């Protein structure tokens, strides 16, 4: 009975319903992201169940503002809830403060929102990690908010089922030197290596960036660079 | 507000909280209603007569409006609430419609409050059945029953509380239409004594005629208990 509600600590001060939501994210399709000096690139492997989807279906990458986006990893519907909240924060920043939301701020807001659903018996934690990619006045930034609401900045990041491998491949990259052009290639390449073929037979790799070439607008990358 | 769902269906279609309210009404004191030509008779069991309860007359048949009277079985305090609501409804009604409330209208209101409480989150059902009796403003007499499910029904005679169904089986056999006042009171006393022990200090009995409601004095009642207990030997 220690593990049925997120309002409860176990005897070791764990919150199991959060660890469990965590597992939802780890059993999900893989995402990676890299924060360069010219921008952020985020890529994610969409696993279809049907051969008959439209290309575009179940986008896991959403813009949240002109300069920021969120790639979701885990339960896509839960993520669209976060994406909606991120968008409300971004709008608020523009409407009240007349400034684009800084990325650290956006990720904090996202984290606070996710964390809130780990405190109260009536809601459950979200089953998704959000990767936030911003390029506002704070510069290129890449955060991840996990279901606990813990938020961390990264140079590069990998989530989902192939996360342990994808991290090994992301460690081979030189983040000080790497550019958004190169990264679209590398990050996509990485998701092709770590994809398991005999399990998940149907897959595209969705990529998005926000960078100096995109006029610091967060956008899917044209499907010529992939 | 606390709004958990208290009354819920169990697997075999049943609403346990309503079955258990009904169990609380089978533990309650008997009450009996009889409908004659020009009279309704409501009679109820009293708990006994310990030398300690106030020798000032406390009625266990309640007046709801001038024309309407209500006995109950089950939880006293639930009943008291229902009755207050019923009282207050009959006034609301006068006040809105000038006319006095038909009995059936009052009964339906009460039964709806009962039903409403089997479906409101936060609340258990009233554990109360009622017998309600009276005359409309047209000289027609009525007698109703509500149970805790909120179901009402008109009867020619009826019983509620302990051994309701023993008493109702009895009454099915005997009961004739178009009884007189005095045959009604007799029939009611007779019917109650199927389950109550003496007829001494443990029967209150109310007689309703168009525009006139009158409780038997303990003396008038005892002429009827002898006239009846002498007819039970045979």
């Amino acid at each position: 009975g220690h593990d049925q509600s997120t309002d409860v600590f176990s005897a070791e001060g764990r919150v199991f319903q959060v660890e469990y939501a965590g597992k939802a994210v780890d059993n999900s399709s893989t995402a990676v992201a890299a924060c360069c000096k010219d921008g952020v690139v985020v890529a994610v492997e969409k696993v279809h169940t049907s051969r008959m989807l439209e290309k575009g279906s179940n986008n896991r990458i959403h813009a949240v503002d002109r300069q920021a986006g969120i790639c979701i990893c885990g339960l896509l519907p839960d993520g669209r809830a976060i994406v909606s909240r991120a968008r409300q924060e971004a709008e608020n920043s523009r409407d009240i403060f007349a400034t684009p939301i800084r990325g650290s701020v956006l990720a904090n807001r996202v984290g606070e929102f996710m964390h809130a659903y780990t405190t109260h018996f009536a809601y459950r934690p979200f089953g998704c990690s959000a990767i936030i990619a911003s390029y506002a006045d704070d510069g290129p930034q890449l955060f991840v908010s996990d279901p606990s609401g813990t938020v961390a900045g990264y140079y590069g990041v990998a989530l989902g089922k192939a996360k342990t491998v994808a991290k090994s491949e992301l460690e081979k990259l030189d983040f000080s030197s790497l550019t958004c052009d190169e990264a679209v290639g590398k990050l996509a390449s990485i998701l092709h290596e770590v994809h398991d073929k005999q399990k998940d037979k149907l897959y595209e790799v969705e990529v998005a960036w926000v960078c100096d070439k995109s006029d610091r607008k967060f956008v899917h990358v044209p499907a010529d660079m992939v | 507000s606390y709004d958990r769902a208290i009354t819920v269906f169990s697997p075999d279609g049943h609403l346990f909280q309503v079955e258990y309210a009904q169990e609380a009404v089978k533990k309650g004191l008997a009450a009996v209603g009889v409908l004659g030509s020009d009279s309704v008779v409501i009679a109820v069991e009293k708990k006994s007569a310990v030398k300690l309860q106030d020798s000032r007359t406390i009625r266990k048949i309640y007046k709801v409006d001038a024309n309407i009277y209500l006995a109950f079985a089950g939880l006293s305090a639930d009943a008291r609430v229902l009755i207050n609501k019923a009282q207050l409804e009959c006034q609301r009604f006068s006040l809105n419609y000038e006319d006095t409330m038909d009995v059936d209208m009052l009964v339906r209101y009460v039964a709806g409050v009962q039903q409403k409480s089997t479906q409101s989150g936060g609340s258990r059902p009233f554990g109360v059945a009622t017998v309600i009796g009276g005359f409309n403003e047209d000289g027609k007499p009525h007698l109703w029953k509500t149970d805790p499910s909120g179901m009402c029904s008109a009867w020619r005679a009826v019983a509620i509380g302990r051994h309701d169904q023993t008493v109702i089986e009895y009454m099915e056999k005997s009961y004739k239409d178009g009884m007189s006042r005095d045959e009604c009171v007799h029939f009611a006393i007779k019917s109650l004594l199927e389950v109550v022990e003496s007829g001494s200090r443990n029967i209150e009995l109310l007689v309703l005629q168009y525009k006139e409601a009158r409780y038997l004095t303990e003396e008038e009642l005892q002429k009827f208990v002898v006239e009846v207990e002498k007819e039970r030997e045979e």
Partner: protein
């Protein structure tokens, strides 16, 4: 039945509050705070095992107001949430009274907030120990004295001369008690203090620390605003510890 909700056990204890205290140590990080005659320091571990994580992005130190820092130790996002609440509390207070919230009041209000989570069911206590540091003006002379107030998940608020929270908070404390029998800690200098703090951290975690594995926050009578101490200066203290 009592282990999972905020009711009393038969021994008169609140399990969920005790377990919230274990959430404080679970991460494995230690924090130490210490006041000297004209400053207060808080040192917390800052462990970035992931080579790819961006060190400047993760922190357990937070400005609450310009004159109050805090260090949260425990479940990080719960700390972040308390900080938000602190911030709100501090800002509502400035609006209502026209003055910056004194740190002992802020602590007290955050203890009230925690206490509530231990008495109203179905709210999870935040599994952190909050450590606010700041200066505090005295009514006699107007001089600023340094303060360290903790708040714990039960809502127990306290002022301290030095304090540790987190993993090995006991061996850190034991070290500072021991160093408090030698010296008088409120007559020290910001250097001698930081040395003690850092040495206590080192003793407890059984290792020598490098500068980038800690993060240090400070308020001083001279400059009362709460400031992250730059690494150059933490390196120099850590050098001063390994030597003497």
């Amino acid at each position: 039945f009592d282990k999972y909700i905020t009711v009393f056990s038969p021994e008169g204890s609140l399990y969920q509050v005790e377990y919230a205290f274990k959430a404080v140590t679970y991460p494995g990080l230690l924090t130490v705070a210490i006041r000297c005659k004209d400053a207060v320091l808080v040192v917390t571990q800052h462990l970035i095992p992931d080579r790819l994580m961006r060190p400047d992005s993760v922190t357990a130190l937070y400005e609450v107001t310009p004159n109050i820092g805090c260090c949260m130790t425990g479940r990080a996002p719960d700390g972040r949430a308390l900080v938000q609440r602190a911030r709100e509390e501090a800002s509502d207070y400035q609006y209502r009274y026209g003055v910056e919230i004194p740190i002992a009041v802020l602590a007290k209000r955050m203890g009230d907030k925690a206490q509530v989570r231990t008495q109203q069911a179905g709210l999870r206590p935040m599994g952190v120990v909050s450590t606010f540091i700041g200066m505090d003006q005295s009514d006699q002379d107007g001089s600023l004295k340094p303060q360290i107030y903790t708040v714990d998940p039960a809502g127990w608020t306290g002022g301290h001369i030095a304090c540790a929270a987190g993993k090995k908070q006991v061996e850190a404390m034991a070290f500072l008690e021991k160093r408090q029998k030698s010296t008088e800690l409120d007559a020290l200098t910001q250097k001698e203090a930081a040395m003690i703090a850092l040495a206590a951290l080192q003793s407890a975690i059984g290792t020598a620390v490098k500068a980038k594995e800690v993060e240090v926050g400070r308020c001083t009578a001279a400059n009362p605003a709460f400031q992250r101490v730059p690494n150059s200066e933490v390196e120099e203290w850590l050098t001063a510890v390994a030597e003497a």
